[PDB]
């Protein structure tokens, strides 16, 4: 019966388908406390700077005119003082393959820190989970990365129309939807049509990661568990693999199942014809308590990650937990250079 | 470089994967208050039924005997004053479809409920989504879903091994792992290898729900968006789908999207050579506040679920929720009964 009744609710839905269709100063003090900074340093800068235009930001508090620098301001002192950006550094596209079994928020917490401001940090969130659980953070949209991959797009394309800003300038989104999922179901085949002679494994490094390569010091991947053409793509492109563990003494488990599957999964790209670039990997306890439990799944953890381990896990609401936060972005960037080295 | 770091990662997890592996009573004047009962007819039923045995519940306070009778004492009440069960007026397993974009909470709720205890309600939540969201209501388990499915079970390994027992008696659990997803992502392959000559979108019915049939009154079917074996066999065993609209307003753009992508689904099961046995729906708002927004969204709901709409949407922590809860339940429950009917 209602097997014909639901085209009917389909068609309703759809009809109406068609129908549907931040702000940081720091004080003067404040970027003096900053690394490779002092008072002198900074009221030098500033005058320097403004000797020869450059505006800073000032605030209308009390009466009188303050002085409250912008991330960018900030930014832009660190550059008069000479001082190399990460995209000085290192060549550039650092892919890193999140293991959600957030992102957004580490990319935030990464561009904005306190003393990685000097870096000038250039992050990318393509969404590839169908839930677009991270496509939350910034009308409607339109160019998914899954469909973005299949429409053989061009970098300038990526930039001014696929690619969307967020709530903090210095990290960009390629946003997904819950239709992506139904792509997947149907990756292969597509991948025939639309992009003849091509690997299905290798889209997401060649379709969008490569075309925008000299944009973004940092590259995260974000995907849910089963699906596979996503999965594989993402692994087929990163070169770094960052395991967060649950504290949860039944997550524990997840993670660890999930983990002794890795294998087979970089298997099939080397059946496909594919390389994998994974090359280093990070893991980490997710707001782990004080909990026997949960104290003891974080024992077990250094274990199966080993030396590859974090040293640091991440996290009353306030001064309380963002303290905590801080040092584990800090961690979390410390371990990138090191292991980005040997 | 940490691509051959990662089986590393992975035999230490298998490894340590390997040493890896309820109370409700009523008062008599409560009874009373029941459908078909009065104090007249339970102080009758109690005295006749234990003139020839039979123990009621009975409570140690104040100092003296109680008289709290168990959910069971109510339905062996109910069945000496001879009124027909849940499974004397129907023909066995009416199977839901759970749109999933909780459910054993329905079925727990439906089994304890007041005006429905005089039903005997048997309900079975088979978990086919990968999360295992439901499964975290019943040691390690061992027999997913996905796994009895291409195993061939007979009724009884399924009764007395692969279903599990929950908090609420009446109300089992067929269990999910995380491990399903990647059973999923190979499914065809493996029914041609375990399952020779089967149809793919079959097994669900075949192999776990007809196996079980003359044993549940009720059958839920849970699973996530993307996956499709899982998804296809659901919509291929299930009588009814029962659509649960999100209020908030992003999460009604996609249950729409997704409604308006059934009829494909129902499509490929016609390529395969199975007759879909959907017959019926359901859709509802789920905790729909007091705001425009959520309020209106919930007016675009009688629109595509036309007639097919609930009267009722489901949901100050207490009385406040549970009495909406409740009659949230009934509502479910008598939409079946009208539907069942024409």
Chains 1, 2 share one sequence.
Do not use: C
Not at 121 to 140: K, W
Not at 169 to 178: F, K, L, R, T, W
Not at 212 to 238: E, M, R
Not at 255 to 266: A, D, H, I, S, V
């Amino acid at each position: 019966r209602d097997y014909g009744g639901v085209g009917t609710i389909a068609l309703r839905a759809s009809a109406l388908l068609k129908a549907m269709s931040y702000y940081q100063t720091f004080t003067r003090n404040a970027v003096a406390k900053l690394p490779k900074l002092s008072r002198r340093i900074v009221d030098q800068a500033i005058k320097e700077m403004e000797e020869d235009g450059y505006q800073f930001n000032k605030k209308q508090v009390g009466n009188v005119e303050q002085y409250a620098l912008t991330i960018q301001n900030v930014i832009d002192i660190y550059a008069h003082r000479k001082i190399p950006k990460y995209r000085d550094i290192h060549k550039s596209p650092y892919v890193i393959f999140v293991v959600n079994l957030s992102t957004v928020t580490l990319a935030h917490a990464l561009r904005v820190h306190q003393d990685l401001l000097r870096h000038d940090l250039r992050i990318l969130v393509i969404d590839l989970d169908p839930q677009a659980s991270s496509t939350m953070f910034l009308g409607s949209i339109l160019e998914t990365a899954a469909q973005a991959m299949l429409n053989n797009l061009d970098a300038e394309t990526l930039r001014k129309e696929v690619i969307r800003p967020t709530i903090v300038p210095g990290v960009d989104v390629i946003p997904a939807s819950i239709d992506d999922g139904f792509v997947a179901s149907q990756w292969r085949e597509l991948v025939e049509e639309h992009l003849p002679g091509q690997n299905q494994y290798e889209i997401l490094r060649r379709n969008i990661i490569d075309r925008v390569a000299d944009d973004y010091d940092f590259i995260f991947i974000d995907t849910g568990p089963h699906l596979d053409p996503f999965l594989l793509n993402g692994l087929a492109a990163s070169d770094l693999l960052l395991t967060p563990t649950p504290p949860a003494q039944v997550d524990f488990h997840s993670t660890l199942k999930y983990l002794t599957r890795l294998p087979e999964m970089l298997e099939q790209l080397e059946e496909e014809g594919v390389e994998p670039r994974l090359s280093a990997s990070i893991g980490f306890m997710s707001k782990m308590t004080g909990k026997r439990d949960h104290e003891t799944s974080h024992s077990l953890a250094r274990e199966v990650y080993a030396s590859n381990i974090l040293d640091s896990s991440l996290p009353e609401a306030l001064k309380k937990a963002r303290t905590e936060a801080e040092r584990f972005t800090k961690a979390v960037f410390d371990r990138i250079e090191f292991v980005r080295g040997e």
